[PDB]
Design a protein around this nucleic acid. Structure first.
Lengths: 75, 158, 173, 187, 226
RNA sequence: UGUGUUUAUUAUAUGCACUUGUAUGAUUAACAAUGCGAAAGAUUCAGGAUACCUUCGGGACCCGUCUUGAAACACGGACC
RNA sequence: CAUCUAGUAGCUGGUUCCUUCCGAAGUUUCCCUCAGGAUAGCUGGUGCAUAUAAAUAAUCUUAUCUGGUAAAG
RNA sequence: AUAUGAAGAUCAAGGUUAUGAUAUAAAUGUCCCAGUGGGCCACUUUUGGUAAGCAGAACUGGCGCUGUGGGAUGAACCAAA
RNA sequence: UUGUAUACCUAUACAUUACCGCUAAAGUAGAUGAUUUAUAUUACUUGUGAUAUAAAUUUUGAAACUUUAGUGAGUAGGAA
């Protein structure tokens, strides 16, 4: 009249049928609940890549015009 | 009929070790945690802020986030029977670096050092791990003090 | 089965910190050589460290009694597990082979002491001469000239004739 | 005794249309011959898509067909739609296109023809391209259905956004406790 | 055009039986090399043992690769970690035999799956009789008997170098670099039942007989099952 | 690998015509005996729980039901 | 007595053709809920995306982290 | 104080895809689809109870839902579906 | 009763085979002188090919035929 509550009997038979299920492996996992000042114009560190090879290997000698920044970055 | 609530059963989980009490050593805050790094969770009982709840102690995740004091780690919990990947904001004192993969990464460092000087020989580069093969044929010499040296099965009487 | 004897030799396979481990050997009585290489390991785990997997079996070879038609008394130093009970015994049997006396001991312990055979460790097995045996049921046979009239035969059942016409007659003359 | 043969041992594809249209099953007669005898996966896509339902063969616009046809190095290809091709009134100039579809809509027929290009059936395509050379194989967007937005609802997660089933629009219709932070909670 | 069809399909017929007659000639010179390997191997071990006795040493012969593993019990009342080793060994029925390499990663599967299984170390004669008499093969998921060398050659000669039966007997017996393919090409050997039957089936071999490593007495039991 | 010393063994070099010699490309195929499917209707051989009856050995509890569990000393059901 | 009235029943009882294929559950949370739901799990149906590797996914070996039970005290 | 960080976006250079064994085809949606939501037995570990064919749990295997062989007999044992 | 030995008996299990289903895979669709097969004239290679004259099989409820493999417990329940 108060019969039989609580068992983990059958509960792993019943949970291994459609199996025990890894989530799946993504190349693009979400950026949400992530540090928003890390993200909010690193949105614009992407949007500042108007070009990346034509006008950009111009820059390797455009800053080697001033011989780079080879010394003073060492602090 | 409890688990319920939040630090229950963690009398031995968030205990300290024996004579490892007191002040936290200072390199615990000097470790660098970049996004996508494998990271174990073993919680610190002497830091009562940012402790993970007890399911995640002993587990292993990857750092998905860095903020000023903590790392978001993405950890797998089996909630039966299926695996959700849980996002747990956990402070830095409760978080360690996994050694598991930096002795895989010292084999990528040798699957290119040994394939480098194999441009001269050619083969076998032998870039796969082999399980423990059965042994060989080998000539055990005695000489060594010739045998017998003979056991017999006897220890009871007392 | 019938329990012939072997010499199983074992090593502890030498990790390079230790060269040339000391090589212990045995006298194992066993039905076949697959069971003599888990009687070696059972008996050596009492005596030295190195189990399997962490040891090797060097040569297991069978030993062929060195006088199969000479007739000799075998003393067996045993120890067994009774129901309340680790004991020692010294039993004596009379045979020609030495694996045939050990197997005449594994039945006798089963008969007389109920001793299912996983309980019996054998210490030693010898070929004691005579006037060193004690065991009165073996000293019966240590006298030329022994007689004993027979009463023992076969009495087929049913037979080459089940309903016989002529009465077997256990006796004659 | 052996092990162990639940599913989907029996695969749950289609092997035939569910369709008693005789003009459609005459194209299945061609394309089983065409797939088996030219083993192009073009002809196996046409066959397998000729079996499909009204969902899984969504329509495709006259403006989405004119705009997939800015594929470079393809000035002479055929637009293949195992499905229908609808008119778009948001497309002011129809280009000169070759369209193979099961149903081309009527007003899409004239705007293709007054340009003027080709409407073809899948047997006028089997003769022109038995291996599907010079073809733009295009389908419609499957989950553009309204029914797909209702799959499926259980609040708690910030993914959800999944469209409850509800008779009218307005307040008084599922907008208070669970929708609104000043009524219970927000979902 | 049919005026060119006898032109084409009579050199495609002449070349076809020039291949088959070519591969009849390889498989005699191939299998003669293999059969001489086994004779030298056996006379080596006889030579080595007889040397180490005279040199007052021991000669520990090589620990064995090639288990042959038979499923002897049941599909009822089986535990999930031992049910899972028996699907990774392709042992899903009583008297199913497969060929297994003996690395440490699989011995600890042969110890998990021990009371449902017997194994041991096959002869050359037992490798042949199981592939000759009982050897079936897997052709696009179907089970195809042998009946000729074209069932083995058509699936393992472009990738691997197996065209004969004695090829498939070679890289299974002497465990070769394409052993993974030489034994997954086979179906599991649907063996008979022994003649004289069994010993106990639920004691170890070393107790009083059956399951686990029989180790050289897998040969005597394959005479009853093949 | 190399080359000879060598002594052994396999393979290829069997074309044309014919024939009751393998896979018959899950082979079962032959010699011989019995017996003729009579114009209408016999007979020979093999088979047959047709609804039974006879005989014998093995098997065999009464169904529906709710139940953890029914042949139940659970309930229902005499028969159409 | 007749009607409303075929009142309601989380309860007992019964629920009518064959073969083929796949095959459960007695657990979760919540409920004036404990002979009952709704919920998730387990099931089936129906598809669809990928058929003349280096795609991955599941019991062992290896690497690493975790653990305070047996034993020990 | 670095438009060397750190994330990102590109070009360069990298033998043999980096244990084993397997692939019952696996992936993903929808009907949130039916029944179910009294269970019961057993080894092992367990709590209450003097005990119980009693009460309560962990683990895996079973009966329910299942014939057949064995234990004379029998839900569950042994074997085998 | 305890310890053993051989030799037998016994399942719906296992192996082979015949047959049913289910599953999964594969083949086949020039009929107009289309495809073959056996002969019978010529270009020529020795031999094959082509023209010609001598008998058939094929309009596969394309939802049909043909080929190969595995497989088979079932209440509640679902589906053909």
């Amino acid at each position: 009249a108060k019969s039989k509550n609580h068992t983990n009997h059958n509960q792993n038979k019943k949970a291994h049928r459609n199996g025990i299920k890894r989530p799946l492996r993504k190349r693009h996992e979400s950026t949400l609940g992530m540090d928003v000042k890390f993200l909010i114009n690193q949105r614009y560190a992407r949007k500042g890549n108007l070009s990346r090879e034509e006008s950009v290997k111009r820059y390797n000698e455009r800053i080697a015009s001033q011989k780079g920044k080879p010394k003073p970055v060492t602090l | 009929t409890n688990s319920k609530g939040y630090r229950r059963g963690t009398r031995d989980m968030f205990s300290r070790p024996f004579r490892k009490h007191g002040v936290i050593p200072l390199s615990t805050y000097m470790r660098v945690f970049k996004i996508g790094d494998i990271v174990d969770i073993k919680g610190h009982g002497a830091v009562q802020k940012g402790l993970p709840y007890k399911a995640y102690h002993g587990k292993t995740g990857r750092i998905f986030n860095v903020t000023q004091h903590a790392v978001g780690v993405i950890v797998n919990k089996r909630v039966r029977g299926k695996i959700l990947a849980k996002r747990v904001n956990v402070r830095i004192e409760h978080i360690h670096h996994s050694k598991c993969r930096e002795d895989f990464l010292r084999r990528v460092k040798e699957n290119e050092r040994l394939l480098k000087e194999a441009k001269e020989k050619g083969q076998w580069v032998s870039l796969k791990r082999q399980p423990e093969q059965p042994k060989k044929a080998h000539f055990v010499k005695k000489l060594e003090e010739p045998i017998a040296l003979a056991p017999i099965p006897y220890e009871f009487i007392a | 089965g019938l329990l012939k004897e072997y010499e199983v030799v074992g090593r502890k396979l030498p990790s390079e910190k230790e060269p040339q481990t000391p090589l212990y050997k045995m006298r194992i009585f066993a039905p076949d050589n697959i069971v003599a290489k888990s009687r070696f390991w059972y008996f050596l785990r009492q005596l030295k460290k190195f189990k399997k997997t962490t040891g090797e079996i060097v040569s297991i070879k069978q030993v062929y009694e060195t006088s199969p038609v000479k007739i000799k008394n075998f003393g067996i130093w045993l120890r067994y597990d009774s129901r309340s009970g680790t004991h020692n015994m010294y039993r004596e049997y009379r045979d020609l082979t030495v694996g045939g006396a050990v197997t005449q001991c594994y039945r006798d312990m089963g008969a007389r002491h109920r001793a299912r055979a996983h309980s019996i460790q054998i210490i030693k097995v010898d070929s004691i001469p005579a006037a060193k045996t004690r065991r009165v049921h073996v000293k019966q046979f240590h006298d030329s000239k022994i007689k004993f009239p027979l009463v023992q035969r076969v009495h087929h059942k049913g037979n080459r004739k089940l309903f016989s016409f002529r009465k077997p007659r256990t006796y004659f003359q | 005794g052996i092990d162990i043969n639940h599913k989907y041992d029996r695969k749950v594809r289609r092997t035939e249309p569910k369709s008693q249209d005789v003009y459609l099953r005459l194209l299945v007669k061609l394309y089983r011959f065409l797939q088996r005898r030219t083993n192009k996966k073009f002809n196996r896509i046409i066959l397998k898509r000729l079996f499909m339902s009204k969902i899984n063969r969504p329509p495709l616009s006259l403006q989405r067909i004119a705009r997939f046809f800015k594929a470079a190095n393809q000035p002479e290809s055929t637009i293949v739609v195992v499905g229908t091709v609808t008119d778009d009134a948001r497309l002011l100039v129809v280009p000169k296109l070759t369209v193979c579809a099961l149903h081309v809509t009527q007003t899409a027929r004239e705007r293709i023809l007054k340009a003027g290009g080709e409407v073809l059936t899948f047997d006028q395509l089997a003769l022109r391209s038995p291996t599907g050379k010079n073809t733009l194989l295009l389908q419609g967007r499957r989950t553009a259905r309204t029914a797909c937005k209702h799959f499926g609802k259980a609040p708690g997660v910030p993914h959800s956004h999944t469209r409850p089933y509800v008779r009218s629009k307005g307040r008084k219709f599922e907008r208070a406790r669970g929708r609104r932070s000043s009524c219970g909670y927000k979902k | 055009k049919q005026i060119s069809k006898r032109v084409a399909e009579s050199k495609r017929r002449l070349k076809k039986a020039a291949v088959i007659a070519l591969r009849k000639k390889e498989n005699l010179v191939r299998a003669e090399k293999y059969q001489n390997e086994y004779i030298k191997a056996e006379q080596r071990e006889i030579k080595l043992r007889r040397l180490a006795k005279k040199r007052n040493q021991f000669y520990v012969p090589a620990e064995a690769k090639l288990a042959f593993v038979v499923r002897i019990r049941g599909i009822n009342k089986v535990a999930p970690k031992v049910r899972k080793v028996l699907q990774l060994f392709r042992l899903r029925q009583i008297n199913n035999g497969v060929f297994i390499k003996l690395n440490k990663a699989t011995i600890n599967m042969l110890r998990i799956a021990e009371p449902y299984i017997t194994w041991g170390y096959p002869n050359l004669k037992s490798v042949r009789e199981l592939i000759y008499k009982r050897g079936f093969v897997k052709h696009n998921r179907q089970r195809v008997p042998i009946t000729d060398n074209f069932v083995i050659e058509r699936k393992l000669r472009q990738a691997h170098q197996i065209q004969c039966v004695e090829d498939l007997v070679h890289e299974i017996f002497t465990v070769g670099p394409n052993f993974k393919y030489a034994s997954n090409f086979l179906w599991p050997f649907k063996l008979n039942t022994p003649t004289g039957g069994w010993r106990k089936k639920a004691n170890h071999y070393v107790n009083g007989g059956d399951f686990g490593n029989r180790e050289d007495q897998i040969n005597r039991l394959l005479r009853k099952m093949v």
